[PDB]
Amino acid sequence: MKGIIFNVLEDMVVAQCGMSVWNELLEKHAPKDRVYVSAKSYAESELFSIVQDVAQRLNMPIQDVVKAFGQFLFNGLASRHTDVVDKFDDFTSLVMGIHDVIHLEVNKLYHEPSLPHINGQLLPNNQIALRYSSPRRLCFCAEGLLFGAAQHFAAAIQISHDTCMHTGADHCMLIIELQNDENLYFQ
Numbered sequence: 001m002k003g004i005i006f007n008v009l010e011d012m013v014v015a016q017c018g019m020s021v022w023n024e025l026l027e028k029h030a031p032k033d034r035v036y037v038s039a040k041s042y043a044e045s046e047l048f049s050i051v052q053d054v055a056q057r058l059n060m061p062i063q064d065v066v067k068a069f070g071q072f073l074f075n076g077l078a079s080r081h082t083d084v085v086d087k088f089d090d091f092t093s094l095v096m097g098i099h100d101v102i103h104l105e106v107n108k109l110y111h112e113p114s115l116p117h118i119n120g121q122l123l124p125n126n127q128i129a130l131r132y133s134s135p136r137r138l139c140f141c142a143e144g145l146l147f148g149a150a151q152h153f154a155a156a157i158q159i160s161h162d163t164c165m166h167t168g169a170d171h172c173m174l175i176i177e178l179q180n181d182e183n184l185y186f187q
């Protein structure tokens, strides 16, 4: 897991809970004097342990916390890789490009990143079928990111998530409904 993901998490924990709390999380779930360098790889278990700790402090379901992180993470990625997100003029284009443009670039920007496998298909009625697959099983982080992407383009979405790696499938299907954006009027 790249340091940048940890850095965005810090911004989140520091904003909601305070810097004193982040240093608790970090002292407890990471080796002495850890510094997350944005471009370096670190053990994904350090992230899961920090996030699991937060979920428990807040008495929240772990996937609700991961989803909320994903939503904060989109903005934090977009502002650190503005050149990548400015390639897209609307939500639907960005979703259709997560795999072949965005995470494709992430392979040129970062040494050997650990990325999911994603394929989007455009459906009738302004829906997208986004198939997700990853051994890390972070489909709820992906829901958050989609909600973040929506906020970014002043779009409104809903997501159905009824095939899931957590309920035994080898992938997830995120059926995205685009309810509104600046180019949707009556329908």
Ligand code: MNH
Pocket: 001, 002, 003, 004, 005, 074, 077, 078, 081, 084, 085, 095, 098, 102, 103, 106, 110, 112, 113, 114, 115, 116, 117, 134, 135, 136, 137, 138, 139, 141, 142, 143, 145, 146, 149
């Ligand atoms: C909305 C769109 C969107 C979705 C659904 C999305 C999905 C994911 C998910 C889920 C993961 C966690 C790992 C896994 O195996 O599941 C992940 C990781 C990652 N993604 Mn993104 N991603 C973006 C946008 C998205 N990404 C943008 C914008 C950037 C920045 C250019 C970016 C760059 C990354 C980086 C960097 C990683 C981390 C890889 C690693 O830690 O090694 N990407």
Ligand code: NA
Pocket: 180, 181, 182, 183, 184, 185
């Ligand atoms: Na509109």
Ligand SMILES: [Zn+2]
Pocket: 139, 140, 161, 163, 164, 165, 166, 171, 172, 173
């Ligand atoms: Zn899932």
